[PDB]
């Protein structure tokens, strides 16, 4: 109602996005954005790209100019942490004692970086040892990308690869270790891992897969790390160490309140948790994917934008929109990587173009269904693949590989013969 209080915990992309979207769909009640971060809400993708390269201003990171919040009558309560949720009393209690009343609650808590087990003690606290999840992390790391200095990145995910490529361009000596048998092991077919490994080895990255760090060596000062130690006995000397071994969803708040949790805050088709008045969105939310018929938790910008809009709709009585093809992207060196859909469980792949060039598309299929598409420097085939998945078009598999037949036509042909 126009006398209904909505409280949003977390001021990341997801949270500020339901706040402004909520106001754009007609919501008239009060809107409280409570986050523990103290900085102005900003984008994350640039923290391992242009901003890390130092080629973008801190201001260009702003999600919204700091004055747009007052203009939309969105109360932004920074530097504030929510410690608990009193469901029956229907309020959230802060650390500074205050209790906020709510009629509608949205958990947009995101996640915290998974700690590296042997980074305990003085290691984690070193200034030359860092995780890459915050603005501080990025600025702290950016100042240490000193030419000829050595860098050891631990973690094979996309952020890790984007850090290595940034460091290479900064003229650092870089080594990347992953416990998996290949980078992006779980999310990509062998040939796409091969492509990334060649690209980075060719650029000068020492990539040791199947490696597991067992400890670190510190300066006699105990203020900085000097080397990384692997289960295989090698000692990798390092001036800087960046770890990116994953994310842990911040579901504590929900678990403590009795809301069902399982590697994320569980939510239904309407984004609601076990409590009708409480919804969750973004990195922290585990939901049942309509398109893939499986419980999943996406950590991406499109997924957060999509879920926040779904929430805005539901709370404003609008009819929610169909699950869109999830997508994600990564920039490494000058290569544009764009991935739509989720490849897990594919029975085969179909390559459109040649894996020998930095220009091709990889289609992952399950039977005659397209689950996902990895594209390299192919923004247009990439964008067109979204409808294949979003609209579940029965595209002809035996044509995906024939580049003489435009993808628009192949899609158009399917979009006309759904039967």
């Amino acid at each position: 109602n126009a006398n209904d209080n909505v409280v949003i915990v977390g001021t990341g992309l997801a949270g500020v996005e339901v706040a402004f979207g909520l106001r754009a769909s007609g919501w008239e009640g009060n809107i409280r954005l409570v986050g523990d971060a103290t900085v102005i809400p900003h984008h994350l993708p640039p923290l391992s790209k242009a901003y890390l390269a130092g080629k973008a201003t801190a201001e260009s990171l702003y999600l919204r100019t700091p004055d747009a919040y007052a203009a939309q009558n969105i109360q932004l309560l920074g530097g504030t942490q929510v410690t608990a949720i009193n469901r029956d009393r229907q309020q959230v209690i802060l650390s500074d004692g205050r209790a906020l009343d709510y009629d509608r609650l949205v958990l947009a808590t995101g996640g915290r970086p998974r700690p590296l087990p042997v980074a305990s003690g003085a290691v984690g606290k070193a200034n030359n040892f860092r995780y890459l999840r915050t603005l501080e992390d990025a600025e702290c790391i950016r100042r240490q990308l000193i030419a000829d200095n050595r860098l050891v990145v631990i973690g094979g995910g996309y952020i890790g690869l984007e850090v290595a490529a940034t460091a290479i361009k900064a003229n650092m000596h870089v080594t990347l270790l992953d416990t998996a048998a290949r980078v992006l092991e779980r999310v990509t077919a062998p040939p796409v891992s091969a492509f990334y490994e060649h690209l980075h080895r060719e650029a000068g990255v020492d990539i040791r897969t199947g490696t597991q760090v067992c400890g670190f060596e510190m300066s006699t000062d105990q203020q900085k790390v000097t080397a990384v130690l692997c289960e295989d006995g090698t000692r990798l000397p390092a001036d800087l160490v960046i770890a990116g071994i994953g994310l842990i969803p911040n579901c504590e708040l929900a678990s403590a309140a009795g809301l069902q949790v399982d590697n994320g805050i569980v939510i239904n088709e309407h984004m609601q948790t076990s409590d009708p008045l409480i919804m969750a969105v973004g990195d922290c939310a585990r939901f049942h994917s309509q398109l893939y018929d499986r419980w999943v938790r996406i950590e991406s910008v499109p997924n957060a934008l999509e879920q926040a809009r779904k929430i805005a709709a539901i709370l404003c009585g609008k009819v929610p929109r169909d699950e869109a093809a999830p997508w994600f992207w990564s920039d490494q060196y000058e290569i544009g990587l764009k991935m739509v859909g989720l490849s897990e469980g594919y029975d085969r792949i179909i390559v459109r173009g040649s894996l020998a060039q930095p220009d091709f598309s990889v289609f992952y299929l399950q039977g005659d269904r397209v689950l996902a598409v990895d594209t390299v420097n192919r923004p247009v085939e990439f964008n067109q693949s979204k409808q294949i998945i979003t609209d579940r078009l029965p595209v002809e598999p035996n044509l995906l590989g024939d580049e003489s037949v435009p993808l628009k036509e192949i899609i158009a042909a399917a979009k006309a013969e759904l039967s």
Binding site: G21, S60, L63, A68, K338, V380, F382, N383
Partner: protein, 104 residues
């Protein structure tokens, strides 16, 4: 340089651009909910979509194949002056431009 976004329902919102910044970045950062730029302004999603008026349809870095390829997917109607606001770097020689926010 100033930009004028003839937004939703007919209304309009005029703004300030640091010059060298795309109309998309400026719009979404100031609350022009009418236009979103999901992809980040790399010309990969087409949610930047805007109708540029003939008043300025010229001297606006003609959309290349990338954009044309993207534009095609615009959920709204595709017009001869449709462009990706994210591929429009505001410059002095473009003061007082008027972009049309397609219907969401």
């Amino acid at each position: 340089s100033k930009v004028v976004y003839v937004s939703h329902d007919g209304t309009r919102r005029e703004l300030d651009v640091a010059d060298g910044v795309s109309l998309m970045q400026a719009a979404v950062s100031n609350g022009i909910y009418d236009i979103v730029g999901d992809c980040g302004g790399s010309a990969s999603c087409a949610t930047c979509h805007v109708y540029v008026n003939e008043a300025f349809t010229d001297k606006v870095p003609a959309a290349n194949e990338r954009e044309i390829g993207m534009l095609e997917s615009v959920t709204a109607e595709l017009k001869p002056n449709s462009r990706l606001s994210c591929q429009i770097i505001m410059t002095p020689e473009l003061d007082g431009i008027v972009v049309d926010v397609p219907d969401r």
